[PDB]
Design a protein around this motif. Structure first.
Motif, mmCIF file in Angstrom:
data_model
loop_
_atom_site.group_PDB
_atom_site.id
_atom_site.type_symbol
_atom_site.label_atom_id
_atom_site.label_comp_id
_atom_site.label_asym_id
_atom_site.label_seq_id
_atom_site.Cartn_x
_atom_site.Cartn_y
_atom_site.Cartn_z
ATOM 1 N N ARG A 101 0.903 -1.219 0.012
ATOM 2 C CA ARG A 101 -0.137 -0.017 -0.116
ATOM 3 C C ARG A 101 0.838 1.155 0.076
ATOM 4 O O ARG A 101 0.274 2.510 -0.164
ATOM 5 C CB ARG A 101 -1.017 -0.043 1.202
ATOM 6 C CG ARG A 101 -1.982 -1.028 0.990
ATOM 7 C CD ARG A 101 -3.120 -0.661 0.153
ATOM 8 N NE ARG A 101 -3.263 -2.268 -0.727
ATOM 9 C CZ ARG A 101 -2.921 -2.471 -2.033
ATOM 10 N NH1 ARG A 101 -1.883 -1.620 -2.296
ATOM 11 N NH2 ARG A 101 -3.559 -3.671 -2.366
ATOM 12 N N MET A 102 2.197 1.068 0.357
ATOM 13 C CA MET A 102 3.024 2.241 -0.009
ATOM 14 C C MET A 102 3.503 2.616 -1.466
ATOM 15 O O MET A 102 4.255 3.657 -1.470
ATOM 16 C CB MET A 102 4.218 2.077 0.974
ATOM 17 C CG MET A 102 4.135 1.896 2.463
ATOM 18 S SD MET A 102 3.252 3.382 2.975
ATOM 19 C CE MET A 102 3.170 2.660 5.013
ATOM 20 N N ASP B 191 3.078 4.314 -4.913
ATOM 21 C CA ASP B 191 2.540 5.552 -5.550
ATOM 22 C C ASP B 191 1.962 6.540 -4.296
ATOM 23 O O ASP B 191 1.449 7.338 -4.585
ATOM 24 C CB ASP B 191 1.483 5.220 -6.160
ATOM 25 C CG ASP B 191 1.662 4.308 -7.685
ATOM 26 O OD1 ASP B 191 2.594 4.702 -8.289
ATOM 27 O OD2 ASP B 191 1.140 3.306 -7.830
ATOM 28 N N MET B 192 2.564 6.265 -3.283
ATOM 29 C CA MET B 192 2.391 7.261 -2.054
ATOM 30 C C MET B 192 3.581 8.480 -2.369
ATOM 31 O O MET B 192 4.539 7.837 -2.920
ATOM 32 C CB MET B 192 2.591 6.808 -0.869
ATOM 33 C CG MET B 192 1.013 6.122 -0.608
ATOM 34 S SD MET B 192 1.242 5.784 1.482
ATOM 35 C CE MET B 192 1.340 7.338 2.030
ATOM 36 N N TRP C 241 6.872 10.019 4.648
ATOM 37 C CA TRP C 241 6.810 8.491 4.114
ATOM 38 C C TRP C 241 7.859 7.632 4.551
ATOM 39 O O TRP C 241 7.550 6.616 4.770
ATOM 40 C CB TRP C 241 6.923 8.968 2.611
ATOM 41 C CG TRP C 241 6.541 7.538 1.789
ATOM 42 C CD1 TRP C 241 5.297 6.951 1.760
ATOM 43 C CD2 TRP C 241 7.507 6.532 1.083
ATOM 44 N NE1 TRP C 241 5.262 5.767 1.026
ATOM 45 C CE2 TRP C 241 6.420 5.577 0.589
ATOM 46 C CE3 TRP C 241 8.785 6.570 0.904
ATOM 47 C CZ2 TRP C 241 7.217 4.614 -0.007
ATOM 48 C CZ3 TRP C 241 9.279 5.649 0.246
ATOM 49 C CH2 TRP C 241 8.673 4.714 -0.374
#
Lengths: 46, 99
Positions: B45-46, B48-49, B55
């Motif tokens: 889920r990290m 394209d952050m 981050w």
């Protein structure tokens, strides 16, 4: 004026002054140049 | 502890069992396991952050979380972001060896 103020020009009454200046030009074209540099891409390290 | 290898079925205990558990955890998502929705990592889920300094505070947490939950025999040393190449983020993960 050191040149036009002669001995014979001042003997006729003619005496010269120079007023040089620059006006303020209207900014009729403010150009912007946008650039995507990767120079600060190495700043995300810590 | 003695486990089996993932491919080829071989019984290996120390070296590759500690590696097949950590390298699986970083790419296994949450909820992929059956009846175990809390196993896995948020690293899938990290993707394209945006790569910010907040981050890296999450990825160094999620490495310390998802390995701190289900892999107590590994002591994490440092998760340093060492290169941002073309959107690819190089995170160095040097782990200690136990057993």
């Amino acid at each position: 004026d050191p040149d036009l103020n002669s001995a014979s020009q001042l003997a006729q009454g003619k005496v010269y002054w120079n007023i040089r200046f620059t006006d303020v030009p209207p900014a009729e074209n403010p150009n912007f140049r946008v650039e995507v540099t990767d120079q600060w891409l190495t700043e995300v390290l810590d | 502890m003695i486990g089996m290898d993932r491919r080829s079925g071989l019984p290996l205990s120390g070296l590759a069992h500690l590696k097949q558990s950590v390298e699986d955890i970083l790419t296994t998502p949450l909820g992929s396991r059956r009846m175990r929705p809390e196993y896995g990592s948020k690293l899938r889920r990290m993707v394209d952050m945006p790569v910010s300094e907040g981050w890296k505070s999450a990825v160094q947490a999620e490495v310390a979380r998802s390995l701190g939950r289900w892999e107590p025999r590994i002591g994490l040393s440092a998760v340093r972001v060492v290169a941002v190449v073309d959107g690819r983020v190089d995170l160095l993960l040097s782990g200690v060896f136990e057993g």
